[PDB]
Structure formats: structure tokens, C-alpha cells
Amino acid sequence: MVETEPVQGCRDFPPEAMRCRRHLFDVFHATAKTFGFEEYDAPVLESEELYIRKAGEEITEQMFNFITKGGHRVALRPEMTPSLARLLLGKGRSLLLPAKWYSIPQCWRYERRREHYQWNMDIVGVKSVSAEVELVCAACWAMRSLGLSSKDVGIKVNSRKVLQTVVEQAGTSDKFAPVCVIVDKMEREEVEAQLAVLGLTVVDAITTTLSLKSIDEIAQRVGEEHEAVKELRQFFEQVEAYGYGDWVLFDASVVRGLAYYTGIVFEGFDREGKFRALCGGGRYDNLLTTYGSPTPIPCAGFGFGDCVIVELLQEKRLLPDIPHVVDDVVIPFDESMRPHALAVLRRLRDAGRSADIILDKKKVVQAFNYADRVGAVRAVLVAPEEWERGEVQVKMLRGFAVPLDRLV
């Protein structure tokens, strides 16, 4: 008896479960198409070097990685963005900008679930916050398309520049990424200890700025035209104008856990406070300069997982079981009628219908139950008497005789 359960931390997707995933992925695809994003992909197996960002990120700490027989250090990707950057760096000048690219990669971790799918959406070559607006609107669009309202969820929005100014005014730029990574852990005294463990108080000014409840209060401390203030107002104006003002809001505690975000950062959340972040993203204008690009390339994007959204949708009763369906089930009255049943099967499919034929040998009434079981819209019985007349019997399920030509 072989082991029927999957490998540790991984999910099986039999048809029932697969219909749920496909319901979600259809939306991710549909939303990307609606927003003009182009699909891409890359190996799930990338070199380990790609994720050595030396900043204590949880994503790179929990990296599912190994050595090949040939000695190479690789990993099942913990995220897509580095892969995207590699592709972009590879294209160089040939890449026409701006580019809007998406994918729904499976991503991995070691030490609970070890895999998830993550819709990625990234805009490349756009300096202005219109990028972040579009991205944030796409995330809302997908949630709305799944039946969620602005009463169910929102997106918290912030800029890392505010904090950058504080870290800059408090004496070096190099430590900013480790700082963001610790500060991200705030949601206690342990995080204060980590900031001390990093070195240097500036800790106090960080806590207060994370607690500032509005942009005007940021403007009090930054002036009405810090980059961050101008950007956020621009951001909120555009999202308001697009018609999703009830979906977004400011929150100064939002930094995200990733090292490479340089500007606007954001996070999807359920308004009942029950679930982890639904999606997360931001601007990362220096990543490609880090990977070696001679010219700086502005980038922004987000990742949107397949689990939290599903738990949420289940809680809201927005994931009813989707039963399998099929247009026609062709029933041979008996085995002598099979070749004729097959010709009819061909006609049905030729015309763009989805059809089965009873493959095994069974009595008509069993075949009808089977048809009902697989969610057939109508059953097409192919019997001798009707066949002579150039006909079949058709019964709608959601037995009048019909010519072959009139079936489709």
C-alpha cells in the first residue's frame, strides 16, 4: 500500500478542489487581461544566488533550497520578483517600455504549508505613482470580481520614503532595508531589541512615525511637499477618480517585509481583522540596479496568494461548490448503436459543444443517472428505431425525437 497523502506541506487538487482554484485563477487572468498585462513564466528552479539579499528577510530565511548532483546551489523559488528582474535584465534595450507583466507561479518554502500559488503583477518603466494606482486597482478589481465589496476588504497604503527621511535625518542609507524588515514585524519589545541589535534614540522616532494616523500628520512632520506626501495625494486622487476610493486608505505602519521596496508599499486586508494579508506589494526602483543594470529601471508590483483569499471567500460564503458540467451525454441504446452514437458524438463536438459518450456497457437508465451525475445539460439517446428515421431522442435535464442536423 503506497502513501496516498502528498509530500509534506503540499496540496493535491482533485477535480472538486481544482474547480475552486480555477475559479480563482480565471479571475487573476481575467483581471490581468482587463488591465492590459502580458503573461510570462520562468523556471520554478532558479539559482540560489538570486535571493541572497543579506537583510534577514523571512522569505529568504525560509528558502526551499538544495545542491544538484553537479554541485550547483539552486532553490525552488520563494517568490517571483527576482525571476522577473532576471528576465528584464536579460532583455535590456530590446525590452519596450513601459511593460506590464503577470504570472501565477507556484512558490515554495521550507519551515504549515511549503507551497502556494501567487498571482504576480508588475509594471516596469513607469516612474510615477500611476503604476501603483493601476496595481492597487487591479488587486481591488480581482477581489470585487470574486464577490467581495469594500465593506469586506481594503488596501492599506504607505510610503517607505517617510521613514527613509527619518533614518536619514538620524544619521546611514545602507541599514534602511534591515530596519524595514524588523519594523515590519511590529504586528513587541522584541522588535525594539532587534533594532538595538542592528545598532544605531532613532528607535523612538521610528515608533512615532509608524503611529501617525494620517497624511496631514505626515505633512505636519514632512511638509506638504515631501516626495511621499505629493505621491500619496496623487495616489489617492487617482484611485478616487478610478472609482475605488472606498477600497483604499493610509496606514503609516505598513512597510512590508521585503528589502527592495523603495517607495509606495501596500497590503490587502479583511476589514474584520480575522486574516493575514491578502496581497502585498510596492515600488522597487533600485532592484535592477542591484542586479547590474547600467540604467536604473523603475518597477512596482504585487503578489496575491491563493490561500488567505480562499479562507476569506469561504467565510463570506462566496465559494459555493462548483459542480462539473457538460452539454451533452450521448447514450448508445446498446453496443450495436455505438458506431452511430460515435458519429453523433462527433457532430456535437464539431459544433463546439462539450459531450461525453457512455464508454462502458450499461443499461439506459444507468446511463441517464450517470448523465445527471456528471451535470449534463441534456442526454442524447441513440436507439435503432429513431436512427432509421434519421433521428435521436433528446431529453433536457435542467424525450422528444430530433433530426441529426437539428441537434447543434
Ligand X SMILES: O=c1ccc(Br)c[nH]1
DSSP state string for 159-209: EHHHHHHHHHHT--GGGHHHHHHHHGGG--HHHHHHHHHH---HHHHHHHH
238 binds its own copies (CB under 8 A): yes
Q: By CB under 6 A, is residue 134 in contact with ligand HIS? A: no
> What cell does 121 get?
503583477
CB-nearer residue toward ligand X: 133 or 259: 259
**Segment (H or E) for 29:** helix 15-34
Report the residue number, 178 or 281, with the smaller CB distance to ligand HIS: 281
- The number of residues in the chain equals 408
Residue 301 contacts which entry, its own copies, ligand X, ligand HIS, none (Cβ below 5-8 A, type-dependent): ligand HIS
Question: What mask, x for binding ligand HIS by CB under 6 A, covers residues 250 to 289?
Answer: --------x---------------------xx--------
Site for its own copies in 16-75 (CB under 8 A): 18-19, 21-22, 33-36, 38-47, 49-50, 66, 68-70, 72, 74
For the record, the C-alpha cell of 274 comes out as 480575522
Which of 116, 185, 221, 362: binder of ligand X (CB under 6 A)? 116
120 lies in the site for ligand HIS, by CB under 6 A? yes
DSSP 220-284: HHH-TTSHHHHHHHHHHHHHHHHT-GGGEEE-TT---S-TT--SEEEEEEETTS-SS-SEEEEE-
Q: Is 59 in the site for ligand X (CB under 6 A)?
A: yes
Q: Determine, following the binding rule CB under 6 A, whether residue 154 of this chain makes contact with ligand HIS.
A: no
Q: Is 86 annotated as a binding residue?
A: no
d(CA 350, CA 264): 52
Stretch that binds its own copies, among 10-18, 184-192, 217-225, 307-315 (CB under 8 A): 10-18
Nearest 5°: CA angle at 48, between 44 and 52? 125
Non-local CB neighbours of 384 within 8 Å, separated by 6+ positions: 333, 336, 337
Is 209 within any annotated ligand binding site? no
Q: CB nearer to ligand X: give 63 or 153.
A: 63
Distances (CA, A) of 2 to 5, 8, 88, 318, 346: 9, 15, 44, 36, 39
Q: Cβ 245 to ligand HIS, closest distance in Å? A: 24
Q: What does each C-alpha distance from 341 to 104, 201, 206, 331, 388 come to in angstroms?
A: 40, 82, 74, 7, 13
Compare residues 41 and 216 and give the one whose CB is closer to its own copies. Answer: 41
Q: How many CA atoms lie within 13 A of 303 on its CB side?
A: 19
192 is in an annotated binding site: no
Of 354, 366, 385, 396, which lies in the binding site for its own copies, with binding defined by CB under 8 A? 354
DSSP state of 6: P
* Residue 51 is assigned to a ligand binding site: no
Residue 109 contact, options its own copies, ligand X, ligand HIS, none, Cβ 5-8 Å cut-off depending on partner type? ligand X
- Residue of the chain from 342, 364, 377, 394 that contacts its own copies (CB under 8 A): 342
What span, in angstroms and rounded, lies between the C-alpha atoms of 385 and 336? Answer: 13
Residue 256 annotated as part of some ligand binding site: yes
Q: Is residue 39 marked as binding?
A: no
Q: How far is the CB of 258 from ligand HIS (least distance, A)?
A: 6
Residues that bind ligand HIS (CB under 6 A): 79, 81, 120, 122, 258, 280-281, 301-303
List of residues contacting ligand X (CB under 6 A): 59, 78-79, 107-109, 113-116
